[PDB]
Structure formats: C-alpha cells, structure tokens
Coordinates of C-alpha atoms and ligand atoms in Angstrom, one line a residue:
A1 CA 53.6 96.5 109.2
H2 CA 56.0 95.5 106.5
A3 CA 54.9 96.8 103.0
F4 CA 57.8 95.2 101.3
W5 CA 58.6 92.1 103.4
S6 CA 55.0 90.9 103.5
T7 CA 55.3 90.4 99.6
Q8 CA 58.5 88.3 99.8
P9 CA 59.0 84.5 100.2
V10 CA 60.3 84.5 103.9
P11 CA 58.5 83.3 107.1
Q12 CA 56.2 86.2 108.2
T13 CA 56.3 85.7 112.2
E14 CA 57.9 83.7 114.9
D15 CA 54.6 81.6 115.0
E16 CA 55.1 80.6 111.5
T17 CA 58.9 79.7 112.0
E18 CA 57.7 77.7 114.9
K19 CA 55.6 75.4 112.7
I20 CA 58.6 74.7 110.4
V21 CA 60.0 71.3 110.8
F22 CA 61.9 70.6 107.5
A23 CA 64.4 72.6 105.4
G24 CA 62.9 73.4 101.8
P25 CA 61.8 76.3 99.6
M26 CA 59.1 78.7 100.7
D27 CA 57.8 79.2 97.0
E28 CA 56.8 77.7 93.8
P29 CA 59.5 76.0 91.8
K30 CA 60.3 78.5 88.9
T31 CA 62.6 78.5 85.7
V32 CA 65.0 81.1 84.2
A33 CA 62.6 81.4 81.3
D34 CA 59.9 82.6 83.8
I35 CA 61.9 85.5 85.0
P36 CA 61.8 89.1 83.1
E37 CA 64.8 89.6 81.0
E38 CA 64.3 93.5 81.2
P39 CA 65.7 95.1 84.5
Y40 CA 63.2 96.0 87.1
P41 CA 61.6 99.3 86.2
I42 CA 63.2 102.3 87.8
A43 CA 62.5 106.2 87.9
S44 CA 63.3 107.7 84.5
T45 CA 66.1 110.0 86.3
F46 CA 67.9 106.9 87.8
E47 CA 69.8 104.1 86.0
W48 CA 71.1 100.7 87.0
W49 CA 74.9 100.3 86.8
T50 CA 76.9 97.2 87.3
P51 CA 80.5 98.2 88.7
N52 CA 83.5 96.1 87.7
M53 CA 84.8 95.2 91.3
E54 CA 88.1 94.2 89.9
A55 CA 88.7 97.7 88.4
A56 CA 90.4 100.1 90.7
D57 CA 88.3 103.0 89.7
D58 CA 84.8 101.3 90.2
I59 CA 86.2 99.8 93.6
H60 CA 86.9 103.3 94.8
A61 CA 83.4 104.7 93.6
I62 CA 81.7 102.0 95.8
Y63 CA 84.1 102.5 98.7
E64 CA 83.3 106.1 98.8
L65 CA 79.6 105.4 99.0
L66 CA 80.1 103.0 101.8
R67 CA 82.6 105.1 103.7
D68 CA 80.1 107.9 103.8
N69 CA 76.8 106.0 104.1
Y70 CA 77.1 102.4 105.4
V71 CA 76.4 100.9 108.9
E72 CA 76.9 103.4 111.8
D73 CA 75.9 103.3 115.4
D74 CA 72.7 105.2 116.7
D75 CA 74.9 107.9 118.3
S76 CA 76.7 108.5 115.2
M77 CA 80.1 108.0 116.7
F78 CA 81.4 105.1 114.4
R79 CA 80.9 104.3 110.7
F80 CA 82.3 101.2 109.1
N81 CA 85.1 102.2 106.7
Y82 CA 85.7 98.8 104.7
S83 CA 88.8 99.2 102.6
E84 CA 89.1 99.1 98.8
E85 CA 91.3 96.0 99.2
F86 CA 88.9 94.4 101.4
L87 CA 85.8 95.1 99.1
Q88 CA 87.8 93.5 96.0
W89 CA 88.5 90.5 98.3
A90 CA 85.0 90.2 99.7
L91 CA 83.0 90.7 96.5
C92 CA 85.3 88.7 93.9
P93 CA 85.8 85.2 95.4
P94 CA 86.1 82.2 93.0
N95 CA 83.4 82.0 90.2
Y96 CA 81.9 85.2 91.4
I97 CA 79.2 86.5 89.1
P98 CA 79.8 90.3 88.1
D99 CA 76.1 90.9 87.3
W100 CA 75.3 90.2 91.1
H101 CA 77.0 93.6 92.0
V102 CA 74.2 96.0 91.5
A103 CA 74.2 99.8 91.7
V104 CA 72.0 102.9 91.0
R105 CA 73.4 106.1 89.7
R106 CA 71.6 109.4 89.1
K107 CA 71.8 110.1 85.5
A108 CA 72.2 113.8 85.5
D109 CA 75.3 114.1 87.4
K110 CA 76.3 110.3 87.6
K111 CA 76.0 110.5 91.4
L112 CA 76.1 107.1 93.1
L113 CA 73.1 106.5 95.0
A114 CA 72.8 102.8 96.2
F115 CA 74.5 99.4 96.1
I116 CA 73.9 95.7 97.0
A117 CA 76.0 92.7 96.3
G118 CA 75.6 89.0 95.9
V119 CA 78.5 86.5 95.9
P120 CA 78.3 82.7 95.4
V121 CA 78.6 80.3 98.4
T122 CA 78.2 76.6 98.7
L123 CA 76.2 76.1 102.0
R124 CA 74.9 73.0 104.0
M125 CA 71.4 74.2 104.9
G126 CA 69.5 70.9 105.0
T127 CA 67.2 70.1 108.1
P128 CA 69.2 70.5 111.4
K129 CA 70.3 67.8 113.9
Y130 CA 67.6 68.3 116.5
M131 CA 64.9 68.4 113.9
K132 CA 66.2 65.2 112.1
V133 CA 65.8 63.4 115.6
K134 CA 62.2 64.8 115.9
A135 CA 61.5 63.6 112.3
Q136 CA 63.0 60.1 113.0
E137 CA 60.7 59.8 116.2
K138 CA 57.7 60.5 113.9
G139 CA 58.8 58.2 111.0
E140 CA 59.5 61.3 108.7
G141 CA 63.3 60.8 108.0
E142 CA 62.8 60.8 104.2
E143 CA 61.2 64.3 104.1
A144 CA 63.8 65.7 106.6
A145 CA 66.7 64.4 104.4
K146 CA 65.5 65.7 101.2
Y147 CA 67.8 68.8 101.1
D148 CA 70.9 67.5 102.8
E149 CA 73.3 68.0 100.0
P150 CA 75.1 71.4 99.9
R151 CA 73.4 74.0 97.8
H152 CA 74.9 76.7 95.5
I153 CA 73.3 79.9 96.7
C154 CA 73.7 83.6 96.9
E155 CA 75.1 85.5 100.2
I156 CA 73.9 89.2 100.0
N157 CA 75.6 92.0 101.8
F158 CA 76.7 95.6 101.5
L159 CA 73.1 97.1 100.9
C160 CA 73.4 100.8 101.1
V161 CA 71.3 103.7 100.2
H162 CA 72.8 107.3 100.1
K163 CA 71.7 109.3 103.3
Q164 CA 70.0 112.0 100.9
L165 CA 67.7 109.2 99.6
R166 CA 66.6 107.4 102.7
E167 CA 63.0 106.3 103.3
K168 CA 61.9 106.8 99.6
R169 CA 61.6 102.8 99.2
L170 CA 64.8 102.6 97.1
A171 CA 66.0 99.5 99.1
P172 CA 63.0 97.3 98.1
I173 CA 63.7 98.2 94.3
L174 CA 67.3 97.3 94.7
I175 CA 66.4 94.0 96.5
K176 CA 63.9 93.1 93.6
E177 CA 66.6 93.9 91.0
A178 CA 69.2 91.7 92.7
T179 CA 66.8 88.9 93.3
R180 CA 65.9 89.1 89.4
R181 CA 69.6 89.0 88.4
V182 CA 70.4 86.0 90.7
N183 CA 67.1 84.0 89.6
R184 CA 68.3 84.8 86.0
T185 CA 71.3 82.4 86.9
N186 CA 69.1 79.7 88.2
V187 CA 69.6 80.4 91.9
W188 CA 66.6 80.7 94.2
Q189 CA 67.9 81.1 97.7
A190 CA 69.9 83.7 99.4
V191 CA 71.5 83.9 102.9
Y192 CA 72.1 87.3 104.6
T193 CA 72.7 88.8 108.0
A194 CA 71.5 92.2 109.6
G195 CA 71.9 93.9 113.0
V196 CA 68.1 94.9 112.7
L197 CA 65.1 92.6 113.3
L198 CA 63.4 91.7 110.0
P199 CA 60.8 88.9 109.2
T200 CA 62.3 86.4 110.2
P201 CA 65.6 85.1 111.7
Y202 CA 66.5 81.5 111.8
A203 CA 69.4 82.2 114.3
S204 CA 70.7 85.3 116.3
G205 CA 73.8 85.6 118.2
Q206 CA 75.3 88.2 120.4
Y207 CA 78.3 90.5 119.7
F208 CA 81.5 90.1 121.9
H209 CA 84.5 92.4 122.1
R210 CA 87.9 91.9 123.6
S211 CA 89.8 95.1 124.4
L212 CA 93.3 95.3 123.1
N213 CA 94.0 99.1 123.5
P214 CA 91.7 100.1 126.3
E215 CA 93.3 103.6 126.6
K216 CA 92.4 104.4 123.2
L217 CA 88.9 102.6 123.4
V218 CA 87.9 104.9 126.5
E219 CA 89.4 108.0 124.6
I220 CA 87.3 107.4 121.8
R221 CA 84.1 106.4 123.9
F222 CA 83.9 103.0 122.5
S223 CA 84.3 101.8 126.0
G224 CA 84.2 103.4 129.5
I225 CA 86.2 102.7 132.6
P226 CA 83.9 100.3 134.4
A227 CA 82.4 101.3 138.0
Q228 CA 84.6 98.8 139.8
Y229 CA 87.8 100.1 138.6
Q230 CA 86.9 103.4 140.2
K231 CA 87.9 101.9 143.6
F232 CA 91.5 102.1 142.5
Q233 CA 94.0 104.9 142.9
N234 CA 94.7 104.7 139.2
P235 CA 91.6 103.1 137.3
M236 CA 93.2 103.4 133.7
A237 CA 96.5 101.8 134.9
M238 CA 94.4 98.8 136.3
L239 CA 92.3 98.5 133.2
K240 CA 95.4 98.4 131.0
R241 CA 96.6 95.7 133.3
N242 CA 93.7 93.6 133.1
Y243 CA 93.9 93.5 129.3
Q244 CA 97.7 93.2 129.0
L245 CA 99.0 90.4 126.5
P246 CA 102.2 88.9 125.8
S247 CA 104.4 90.5 123.1
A248 CA 105.0 87.5 121.0
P249 CA 103.0 84.2 120.4
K250 CA 103.2 81.4 122.8
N251 CA 102.6 78.4 120.6
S252 CA 105.6 76.8 119.1
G253 CA 105.6 76.5 115.5
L254 CA 103.1 79.2 114.8
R255 CA 103.8 80.9 111.2
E256 CA 101.8 82.5 108.5
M257 CA 99.8 80.4 106.2
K258 CA 101.4 79.7 102.9
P259 CA 100.0 78.2 99.6
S260 CA 101.3 74.7 100.4
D261 CA 99.2 74.6 103.5
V262 CA 95.9 75.0 101.6
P263 CA 95.1 71.1 101.4
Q264 CA 95.9 70.5 105.0
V265 CA 93.8 73.6 106.2
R266 CA 90.9 72.6 103.9
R267 CA 90.9 69.1 105.5
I268 CA 90.9 70.2 109.1
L269 CA 88.5 73.2 108.5
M270 CA 85.9 71.2 106.7
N271 CA 86.1 68.3 109.1
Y272 CA 85.5 70.9 111.9
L273 CA 82.5 72.8 110.2
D274 CA 80.7 69.6 109.4
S275 CA 79.7 69.3 113.0
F276 CA 77.4 72.4 112.8
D277 CA 74.1 72.7 111.2
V278 CA 74.6 75.5 108.7
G279 CA 78.1 75.8 107.3
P280 CA 79.9 76.6 104.0
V281 CA 81.8 74.0 101.8
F282 CA 85.0 75.4 100.4
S283 CA 87.1 74.1 97.6
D284 CA 90.9 74.5 97.4
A285 CA 90.5 77.7 95.5
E286 CA 88.1 79.2 98.1
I287 CA 90.3 78.1 100.8
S288 CA 93.1 80.0 99.1
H289 CA 91.0 83.0 98.4
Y290 CA 89.4 83.6 101.9
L291 CA 92.3 82.5 104.1
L292 CA 95.7 83.3 102.5
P293 CA 97.2 86.2 104.1
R294 CA 96.4 89.5 102.3
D295 CA 98.0 92.6 103.6
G296 CA 95.6 95.0 105.6
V297 CA 92.7 92.5 104.9
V298 CA 93.0 88.9 106.2
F299 CA 95.7 87.4 108.7
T300 CA 96.0 83.7 108.9
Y301 CA 98.4 81.6 111.0
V302 CA 99.0 77.9 111.1
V303 CA 100.5 75.8 114.1
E304 CA 103.3 73.5 112.4
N305 CA 105.3 71.5 114.7
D306 CA 107.5 68.4 113.4
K307 CA 106.4 69.2 109.7
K308 CA 102.5 68.8 110.1
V309 CA 99.8 71.5 110.3
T310 CA 97.6 70.5 113.1
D311 CA 95.8 74.1 114.0
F312 CA 95.0 77.3 112.3
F313 CA 93.3 80.8 113.0
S314 CA 92.4 83.6 110.8
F315 CA 91.1 87.1 111.5
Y316 CA 90.2 90.0 109.1
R317 CA 90.5 93.8 109.5
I318 CA 87.8 96.5 109.2
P319 CA 88.5 99.9 110.5
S320 CA 85.8 102.3 111.5
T321 CA 85.8 106.0 111.1
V322 CA 85.6 107.8 114.5
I323 CA 83.2 110.4 113.7
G324 CA 84.2 113.0 116.3
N325 CA 87.7 113.1 117.9
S326 CA 90.8 115.3 118.0
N327 CA 93.3 112.6 118.7
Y328 CA 92.0 109.5 116.5
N329 CA 90.4 109.1 113.3
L330 CA 90.1 105.3 113.2
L331 CA 89.1 102.4 115.4
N332 CA 91.1 99.4 114.1
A333 CA 89.2 96.3 114.6
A334 CA 90.3 92.5 114.2
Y335 CA 87.3 90.1 113.7
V336 CA 87.7 86.5 114.5
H337 CA 87.2 84.5 111.0
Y338 CA 87.6 80.7 110.7
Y339 CA 89.8 78.4 112.8
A340 CA 90.4 74.7 113.7
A341 CA 92.1 73.2 116.6
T342 CA 93.1 69.5 116.7
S343 CA 96.4 69.7 118.9
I344 CA 95.7 72.4 121.5
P345 CA 92.7 73.7 123.3
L346 CA 90.7 76.4 121.5
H347 CA 91.5 79.1 124.2
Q348 CA 95.3 78.5 123.7
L349 CA 95.0 78.9 119.9
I350 CA 92.9 82.1 120.1
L351 CA 95.2 83.6 122.8
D352 CA 97.7 83.8 119.9
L353 CA 95.2 85.4 117.8
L354 CA 94.9 88.2 120.4
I355 CA 98.7 88.5 120.7
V356 CA 99.1 88.9 117.1
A357 CA 96.3 91.3 116.4
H358 CA 97.6 93.4 119.5
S359 CA 101.2 93.3 118.2
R360 CA 99.9 94.5 114.6
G361 CA 98.3 97.6 116.3
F362 CA 94.7 96.5 116.4
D363 CA 92.5 98.2 119.1
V364 CA 89.7 95.5 119.7
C365 CA 89.0 91.9 118.7
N366 CA 85.2 91.5 117.7
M367 CA 83.2 88.3 117.1
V368 CA 79.8 86.7 117.3
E369 CA 79.0 83.7 119.6
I370 CA 78.8 81.2 116.5
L371 CA 81.1 78.3 115.9
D372 CA 82.8 77.3 119.4
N373 CA 83.4 81.1 120.2
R374 CA 81.6 80.7 123.7
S375 CA 84.3 78.2 124.8
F376 CA 87.1 80.8 125.3
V377 CA 84.9 84.0 126.2
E378 CA 85.8 84.1 130.0
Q379 CA 89.4 83.0 130.1
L380 CA 90.3 85.4 127.3
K381 CA 88.2 88.3 128.8
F382 CA 85.7 89.0 125.9
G383 CA 82.7 90.8 127.0
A384 CA 79.2 90.7 125.5
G385 CA 78.2 93.8 123.4
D386 CA 74.7 95.4 122.7
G387 CA 72.3 94.2 120.0
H388 CA 72.2 90.9 118.3
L389 CA 73.0 89.9 114.8
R390 CA 70.5 88.0 113.1
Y391 CA 70.9 85.3 110.3
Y392 CA 68.2 85.2 107.5
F393 CA 67.4 83.1 104.3
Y394 CA 65.6 84.3 101.2
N395 CA 63.1 81.6 100.0
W396 CA 64.0 78.9 102.6
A397 CA 62.0 77.6 105.4
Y398 CA 64.2 76.6 108.2
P399 CA 63.7 75.5 111.9
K400 CA 65.2 77.9 114.5
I401 CA 68.7 76.9 115.5
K402 CA 71.1 78.2 118.3
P403 CA 74.0 80.3 117.2
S404 CA 76.4 77.6 118.3
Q405 CA 74.9 75.7 115.3
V406 CA 76.1 78.2 112.7
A407 CA 79.5 77.9 111.0
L408 CA 79.1 80.6 108.5
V409 CA 81.2 83.9 109.1
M410 CA 79.5 86.9 107.6
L411 CA 81.9 89.8 106.6
Ligands
MYA1 C1 67.4 84.4 95.4 C2 68.2 85.7 95.6 C3 67.5 86.7 96.5 C4 68.4 87.9 96.7 C5 67.9 89.1 97.8 C6 67.7 88.4 99.3 C7 67.3 89.5 100.3 C8 68.2 90.4 100.7 C9 67.7 91.4 101.6 C10 68.9 92.5 101.9 C11 69.9 91.9 103.1 C12 70.8 93.1 103.2 C13 72.0 92.8 104.4 C14 72.8 93.9 104.6 O1 73.6 94.4 103.9 S1 72.5 94.5 106.3 C15 73.3 96.2 106.1 C16 72.3 97.2 105.7 N1 72.9 98.6 105.4 C17 72.9 99.5 106.3 O2 72.5 99.4 107.7 C18 73.6 100.8 106.0 C19 73.0 102.1 106.3 N2 71.4 102.0 106.0 C20 71.1 102.2 104.8 O3 71.8 102.2 103.8 C21 69.5 102.3 104.5 O4 68.9 102.6 105.9 C22 68.9 100.7 104.0 C23 69.6 100.4 102.8 C24 69.4 99.7 105.0 C25 67.3 100.8 104.0 O5 67.1 102.1 103.1 P1 66.1 103.0 103.8 O6 66.2 103.2 105.1 O7 66.2 104.3 102.8 O8 64.5 102.4 103.6 P2 63.7 102.2 102.2 O9 62.6 103.2 102.5 O10 64.6 102.3 101.0 O11 63.2 100.8 102.5 C26 62.3 100.3 103.6 C27 62.2 99.0 103.6 O12 63.6 98.3 103.8 C28 63.5 97.3 104.8 N3 64.9 97.4 105.5 C29 65.4 98.2 106.2 N4 66.8 97.9 106.4 C30 67.0 96.6 105.8 C31 68.0 95.8 105.9 N5 69.2 95.8 106.5 N6 67.8 94.5 105.2 C32 66.7 94.3 104.7 N7 65.7 95.2 104.5 C33 65.7 96.4 105.2 C34 62.5 97.9 105.8 O13 62.1 96.9 106.8 C35 61.6 98.3 104.8 O14 60.7 97.4 104.3 P3 59.2 97.2 105.0 O15 59.3 96.8 106.5 O16 58.6 98.3 104.7 O17 58.7 95.7 104.6
A6M2 N1 75.5 91.8 106.6 C1 75.8 92.4 107.7 C2 77.1 91.6 108.2 C3 77.0 91.7 109.7 O1 76.0 91.9 110.5 N2 78.3 91.9 110.4 C4 79.7 92.1 109.7 C5 80.5 92.0 110.9 C6 81.9 92.7 110.6 O2 82.5 91.7 109.8 C7 79.6 92.7 111.9 C8 80.1 92.5 113.4 C9 80.2 93.7 114.3 C10 80.4 93.8 115.5 C11 80.9 92.4 116.1 CL1 81.5 92.3 117.8 C12 81.2 91.3 115.2 C13 80.7 91.3 113.9 C14 78.3 92.2 111.8 C15 75.9 94.0 107.6 C16 76.3 94.6 109.0 C17 77.5 95.1 109.2 C18 77.8 95.6 110.3 C19 76.6 95.7 111.4 CL2 77.3 96.1 113.0 C20 75.5 95.1 111.1 C21 75.1 94.6 109.8
MG3 MG1 65.1 104.9 100.1

C-alpha cells in the first residue's frame, strides 16, 4: 500500500498507534558519523541545489515554483500564493540552518523542479497528560517522563514537485535527502502537517472559516448563498448583514505590538501554551521574529491598559490565486496565529482580530480547531470547512491526542 512510507520510522497503522503509551523514538539511536556525507544519489540529469532564502533572487525562484505548483483544491479553483516576504519570514527564523532548504534543478536548462524545507523548532513532545495519568495508575511514571524536556527538532513544510514531474517518485528522494541533512546536524525527529492522510497522524483538527467579504466569497465560488437565505427577498443583503462587523476595534488600549512588548508577550504566551500537551518554546528572539508586525505578512496587536500588556492576538496573511474569474485574481485570507487572553474573554479578543482583518481588506479568516479556538466558533460565526488537517511526527512514537491539546501553529 505505501512503498515509501512503509520503509520509514513512523507508526504504520492506527492499531500500532493505539498500542503507544509513552513518547519516545521509533528507531535505533544513531550518530552523525553513521550518516552518509555524500548527498543521496539522484538521476544524472538532475542536481541538488541549496537556495539562499535571504537572497531576493533565490527567494523569487522558489516563490514561482510554489505559486504555480503548490497546494490547490480538487476543483482547481484556488492555489496557495505565499508571498516572497512570507517565505523569507517562514524559512529564516532565529538560528535557521541554510542546508535544510533543499531543491532539485534540471541541469540542462536549470529548470527548478522540486523543493522541501526544514526549520528548527523547540518543541514540548513528551508523554501527554492523559497518558501520564494512565502511567501513574500502573506505576510507570518514570518511563512516561523520560522525554518531558523540550526538544530541538525540525519542522518540515513546503514540499512541492513541479506538475510535469508528478507521480515519478521524486517526493521520496527529496524526503530522504532532507532527512540526511537534518540527521547530519544531530537532529533525529521532525514534525509536519498535511491535509492528506498518511501513516499515521497523532492528532487531526477540522478547518474553520469566518466570512469577512461574503459577496466576493460567493462571486469567486469559495462560498454559496446557503439555502435558508433563499427565503428572503434579498438573500445576499441578508448574508452581508449576518457577517457585518464594527469598523473599528472595541477593546480599549488595543495597539500594534512593538519591540518593547516582547518580554511581556513571551511571558503570557508561554504560560498559556504550557497547558497543552504539544507546544513550542520560544525565546525572546523567536517571539520577536514570529510576532512583531511585518507588512503584508504578520499582524499582531496587544491590549495595553494603564501601561501593562494583558492580552494579545496575531494573524498572518496568505493570498490564494483565484484560478478562473473575470472580477478577481486573489482571495485574501487572514489565518489565526498565536494569542493569549488574561484580562478579557477569548471571544472578545478574537472579535477585534476579525474587525482588524476586515478593515485591512481580508476576505475570510481561517483557522484550525487547535488551542482554545473552539471556544469562540459559534458566537463569532465561524463554520467548519471540509477535510481535516493532520499532525505527524517523524521517528517519534506518540499517543493519539485531541486537537484542543495541540498548541503548534503550522504555516
Ligand atoms: C529527522 C528529519 C526528518 C525529515 C523528514 C520528515 C518527513 C517529512 C514528510 C514530508 C511532509 C511534507 C508536509 C507538506 O509540505 S504537506 C504539502 C505537500 N505539497 C503539496 O500538496 C503541493 C502539491 N503536490 C505536490 O507537490 C506533490 O503532489 C507532492 C510533492 C505532495 C508528492 O509528489 P507526487 O504526487 O509527484 O508523488 P511521488 O510519486 O513523487 O511520491 C509518492 C509518495 O509521496 C507520498 N506523499 C504524497 N503526498 C505527500 C505529502 N503531503 N507528505 C508526505 N508524503 C506524501 C505518497 O504517499 C507516496 O508515498 P507511498 O504512499 O508510495 O509510501
Ligand atoms: N504543511 C501543511 C501546512 C498546513 O496544512 N496548513 C497551512 C495552513 C495555512 O497557513 C492551512 C490552512 C488551510 C485552511 C484553514 Cl481554514 C486553516 C489552515 C493548513 C501544508 C498545507 C498547506 C495548505 C493545505 Cl490546505 C494543506 C497542507
Ligand atoms: Mg514525482
């Protein structure tokens, strides 16, 4: 059934997953000296290429490949269009490793054919709370605690093969080369998400969408006018009304995050994320990188009253190309990123997210039901979408957990 995935160190079935009771490695402890120094073999007409993702020209080459060949829906209506600024931000966080950005080029015409990228993350990934309780009940707490400390691992994303090269087994080769380069830095696990089902997720969460510009979303066929609105004289007028938002934020003391907010935001985020079984640990430099506003890419606001920051939210932007429409070219989507609420309810904080996103001309706000995102779905008029995102580890056995126990946002 899976000629590549069956050869890799990951749980092979739900049955196998169900037997997993402690966090820990799937495979044999190995060393850097055990790993081939020579790149993985590749066809004599292709070559490995390491782009410099801080150099505008190399970022643009990778941007075009993704623009034309990255994730699209089954009806070929929308294709992700991650921007050049967004790619530099996502792929070059503090202490990133340039050698983890891996491409294939055709030698003859230097045509870019494929890409995959890894970035460092410090991740809590030890046994989850409900399996620690089961371990305690059996007298097995020692074994359950062995990997509690945060681990420096790899997050993999942006795997892409050009449409002309599909179904030629190029993705496994890219994956094997990326794994070699990661293991050559003495890192042996990765985390990754996909919309497709592979062997074997440790968590899965549904998509949610919140309409901001319903007339545009219906015109581009992202949305339809739902059946119950057909009982009205003007179904679209009533749809617009249903999704209408204030034109300015409601929370007093809301303002953009600045560098001087970094220690307070780090404090309240890390206290919040601690409560979840799987979550990142961010340094001041990582908080700066992932949360300070960056035009067109990430938008972050704090609630500051009487000189103290007590709450914050962030969202990021990814436009999608609208593959067939005379009126519009782009779907401008805002995605819920990290947040923390200590002074106001989460729904009141995220209402201001929606207000800001709508004021800035976003068409839809999207998120996955991770974190406490279920706590404001109904009041804020999010609806579930189709399909499931799925969280995976490479070379890590992990008990199945609920998505409300995952705190890692995946870009
Ligand atoms: C310690 C460090 C470890 C580092 C590595 C950790 C692992 C990271 C794993 C990567 C995580 C990436 C996270 C993201 O970026 S998820 C986003 C993935 N990208 C897209 O969906 C963009 C559009 N599609 C494509 O570009 C191609 O269709 C891809 C590149 C997806 C496959 O190309 P193609 O269609 O030409 O097929 P092939 O003949 O070359 O290969 C067929 C094999 O590939 C397996 N396949 C198909 N889709 C995926 C997928 N999304 N993750 C993992 N495996 C996938 C498939 O089951 C089959 O294996 P098996 O079933 O035969 O066994
Ligand atoms: N490594 C994956 C990351 C992921 O699954 N995401 C990225 C996230 C956008 O930042 C997207 C998403 C899509 C829709 C909603 Cl409502 C929320 C998040 C899922 C690659 C990917 C990207 C997009 C999709 Cl739809 C499926 C897989
Ligand atoms: Mg292929």
